[PDB]
Amino acid sequence: IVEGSDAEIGMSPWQVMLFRKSPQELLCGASLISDRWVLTAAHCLLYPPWDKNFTENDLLVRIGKHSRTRYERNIEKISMLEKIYIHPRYNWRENLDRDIALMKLKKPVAFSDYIHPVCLPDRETAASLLQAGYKGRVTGWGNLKETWTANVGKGQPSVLQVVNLPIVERPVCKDSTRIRITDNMFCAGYKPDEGKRGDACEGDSGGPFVMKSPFNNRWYQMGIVSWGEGCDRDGKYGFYTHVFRLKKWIQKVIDQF
């Protein structure tokens, strides 16, 4: 996260870390939508272009973390994957359309003061929260800078970072990339004349873009950290997977009934 802040403890109890076994490394962010399901970005598991193709056994899921590198014995929970589901129409070749994916935990996780699920939006909620100008909140353990002087510092944060960005008008998003954006995406970030900055960055992908409902006091996951052109560049914005439209697929995958 660029130009963010340290999150307070228990600020995003739904924040999940995607850990790689060997080499041990941070793959991506992800969210807890329930007792056994994790929502992440597809490009975190599969991106041929870089020979990226993880399987259920190559990863671990760590829930309830604050510190990036520590092994928080008393607070975090380390889960193994039972099955991974990628959106059948995930387009990693041209625009990363439908960059969404679910992961099924092997055993349900026990909720706590540090581990709690986020809500998924309903039609009306999406309808009234997803409006340009309204602010969202991104969280992660990714790069603090798009680039930096090697060995002179640390590109990564010690604890979970947080940043609040506004939603940008489609037309504005469209005119910022040569890429073909779809109705399955949305962009966020401050504008050049806005006097503020902030963006997600490498490592933050799969992370959740959430919004707070003033009427019910609950947090809703409107998007997933998807892609972007560098980090915190002027006249550029971050692209997020539109969680509301891909909902039927989620519905269909989860099968709660």
Partner: peptide
């Protein structure tokens, strides 16, 4: 960096 997690997971 990472502190080492229990190996049963590794």
């Amino acid at each position: 960096d990472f502190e080492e997690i229990p190996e049963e997971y590794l």
